[PDB]
Nucleic acid binder design. Structure first.
Ligand SMILES: [Ca+2]
Ligand SMILES: [Ca+2]
Ligand SMILES: [Zn+2]
Ligand SMILES: [Zn+2]
Ligand SMILES: [Zn+2]
Ligand SMILES: [Zn+2]
Ligand SMILES: [Zn+2]
Lengths: 512, 131
RNA sequence: UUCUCCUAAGAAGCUAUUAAAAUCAC
RNA sequence: AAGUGAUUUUAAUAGCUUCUUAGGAUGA
């Protein structure tokens, strides 16, 4: 071959080009070529009336320059940057009249379910410079894509849709990350669409700020971070990954549709971006928690984790001291960290798999309801952050509700969601069928700490001898309110707690 | 299909200048990290004994000069981007360029660095004997 | 008779180019 | 009048190796 497809002439004119107004050795017409070196005959006048179309198809970004960072990143750092995955799929049309042999981006779909319909504009060559103008276009023939019949007939100029691309992106990623990792599937005529709104250069800094630079403006030459990007046009320095190169087979809709059962559409370009993201989320984080890739602190991480630990240390101690369980089972704790060391139960390690330590004799099993329905009949089983389809009748379950959306709970695969808080937990879909054997837990607080000597609080939920008496003590009021704060903060975070059927809050009273 | 006009060697350097806010530094910072120079530039079998001048509408050259196709040395036009001048009109497109024959291999480079002088019509500092 | 070399012919392969069936991808 | 790339098969052609055949000449 030794000839590429980039900048291929899409012109429907037979002739070639003069010595001047000709880009390369191949764009010169065949007439002048004597001894592989053109010569300007006096006769043939160079054109003054021509417009001609240039094929921006088939870029290639495979450099390594001393100052500029890489567009295409690895899966290792792509997995570390999961807060910045935005699907991207385009759907263009074929150049039809007075041009042929290329495609023009028409519909732009992003993972956030916002299409964009853009008038077909390609780069066109003139006897003075290059231009950016309309082109005659016809929707491709097919019964796969038919909804494209009136979509072309309406269209927004490309300058208005560039504002919406930043208007959209700057809304989502404003307080999630500081970069954008575009997940593509075809890698080809997606780079062609990125030509219309991308710019790269050396690492700058947001004027009127202190952050990284991630947004371009060609009106005022200034580059902005996300929170300060109002009125700017182009996108700065993006990163992009291609999913097909992870060893996938054949076309797209099939290989996503082995896992999920929801994602689908007619052929909308938005519904293409959702599947492409759902593929990498499954492929990467659905069958492990690495424990080795830490994550930055976005907000409330420390407090949420502390509240979760406090309530976990609380409820299990309450349950054991209430029901006098002989044996306590535990599932899913990677290492052996005893939540309540001051207990009498034997804490056997019904862990999923051995995690980097054999010191405390952690044993190995996987749990399924149909397999282990009659295996564990003694004591109670601690399913903290477990992923089993159904829990047994004697259990303390704390499952993350996936229907709550926040900056912590990213959307995931198969209805399940990715909870990224100092670690990546891919909890599956939250269904009521998993808790047929369980019930909800009421709110309460039980401490054995002796009372020592402000607004009075009268709540029967708290169980202390002081509040059992007529006057509540300042050695328990603040503890009660702080526990209430932790509990409400964690329920707002999204965890849901479940207790066995025979749980009785009155059984705690007679212990005193 | 559609007629093609580029070699696989120029794929990487044309892609770099396409996405570039500063196309001037971008190419200069490619050659800086020893990237190979842009290739397949149009060339002219000039009679090579003629009036030496910076840019000419007619093919001309000296012993020390080498004549090139105009639209090929504009890195902007070669990369199909906007021209940072006013009138939005490339000046190179329309004439023949006469490079000094020492740096004759990378012609797109030279125009990025030195310009024409308007007192004699030669590239200033390379024979523009306005001592 | 043997050796080398050259000319041509026939064979197989390699890479290079040109044109064609079908497959995979968008 | 005719979109894009990749892998494919064969045919046509060129370059080169080896092998075989024939010819020429050198030397024993
Ligand atoms: Ca795609
Ligand atoms: Ca698609
Ligand atoms: Zn800022
Ligand atoms: Zn899915
Ligand atoms: Zn007290
Ligand atoms: Zn120009
Ligand atoms: Zn001078």
């Amino acid at each position: 071959e030794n000839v590429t497809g980039l900048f291929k002439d899409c012109s429907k004119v037979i002739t070639g080009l003069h010595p001047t107004q000709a880009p390369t050795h191949l764009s010169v017409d065949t007439k002048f070529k004597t001894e592989g070196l053109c010569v300007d005959i006096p006769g043939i006048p160079k054109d003054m009336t021509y417009r001609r179309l240039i094929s921006m198809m088939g870029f290639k970004m495979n450099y390594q320059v001393n100052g500029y960072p890489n567009m295409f990143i690895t899966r290792e750092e792509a997995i570390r940057h999961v807060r910045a995955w935005i699907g991207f799929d385009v759907e263009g049309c074929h150049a039809t009249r007075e041009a042929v042999g290329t495609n023009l981006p028409l519909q732009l779909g992003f993972s956030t379910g916002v299409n964009l319909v853009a008038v077909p504009t390609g780069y066109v060559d003139t006897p003075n410079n290059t231009d950016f103008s309309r082109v005659s276009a016809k929707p491709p023939p097919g019964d796969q894509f038919k909804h494209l019949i009136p979509l072309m007939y309406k269209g927004l100029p490309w300058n208005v849709v560039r504002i919406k691309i930043v208007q959209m992106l700057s809304d989502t990623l404003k307080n999630l990350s500081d970069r954008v990792v575009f997940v593509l599937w075809a890698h080809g005529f997606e780079l062609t669409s990125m030509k219309y709104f991308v710019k790269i250069g050396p690492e700058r800094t947001c004027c009127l700020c202190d952050r990284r630079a991630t947004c371009f403006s060609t009106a005022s030459d200034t580059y902005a971070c996300w929170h300060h990007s109002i009125g700017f046009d182009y996108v700065y320095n993006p990163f992009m990954i291609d999913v097909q190169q992870w060893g996938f087979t054949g076309n797209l809709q099939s290989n996503h549709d082995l896992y999920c059962q929801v994602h689908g559409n007619a052929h909308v370009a938005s519904c293409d971006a959702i599947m492409t993201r759902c593929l990498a989320v499954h492929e990467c984080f659905v069958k492990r928690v690495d424990w080795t890739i830490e994550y930055p602190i976005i907000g409330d991480e420390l407090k949420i984790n502390a509240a979760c630990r406090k309530v976990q240390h609380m409820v299990v101690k309450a349950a054991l001291l209430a029901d006098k369980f002989p044996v306590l089972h535990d599932i899913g704790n990677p290492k052996a960290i005893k939540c309540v060391p001051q207990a009498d139960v034997e804490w056997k390690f019904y862990d999923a798999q051995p995690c980097s330590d054999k010191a405390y004799k952690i044993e190995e099993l996987f749990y399924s309801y149909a397999t282990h329905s009659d295996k564990f009949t003694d004591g109670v089983c601690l399913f903290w952050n477990c992923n089993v389809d159904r829990y047994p009748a004697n259990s303390i379950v704390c499952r993350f509700d996936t229907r709550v959306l926040s900056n912590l709970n990213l959307p995931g695969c198969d209805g399940g969601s990715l909870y990224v808080n100092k670690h990546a937990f891919h909890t599956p879909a939250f269904d009521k069928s998993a808790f047929v054997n369980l019930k909800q837990l009421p709110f309460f607080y039980y401490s054995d700490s002796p009372c020592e000597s402000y607004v009075p609080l009268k709540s029967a939920t708290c169980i202390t001898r002081c509040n059992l008496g007529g006057a509540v003590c300042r050695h328990h009021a603040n503890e009660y309110r702080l526990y209430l704060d932790a509990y409400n903060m964690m329920i707002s975070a999204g965890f849901s707690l479940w207790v066995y059927k025979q749980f009785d809050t009155y059984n705690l009273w007679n212990t005193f | 299909a559609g007629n093609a006009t580029e070699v696989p060697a120029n794929s990487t350097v044309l892609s770099f200048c396409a996405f570039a806010v500063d196309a001037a530094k971008a190419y200069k910072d490619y050659l800086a990290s020893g990237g190979q120079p842009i290739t397949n530039c149009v060339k002219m079998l000039c009679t090579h004994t003629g009036t030496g001048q910076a840019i000419t509408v007619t093919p001309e050259a000296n012993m020390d000069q080498e004549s090139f196709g105009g639209a090929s040395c504009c890195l902007y036009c070669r990369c199909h981007i906007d021209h940072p001048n006013p009138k939005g009109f490339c000046d190179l497109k329309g004439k023949y360029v006469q490079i000094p024959t020492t740096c004759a291999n990378d012609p797109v480079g030279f125009t990025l660095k030195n310009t024409v002088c308007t007192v004699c019509g030669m590239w200033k500092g390379y024979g523009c004997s306005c001592d």
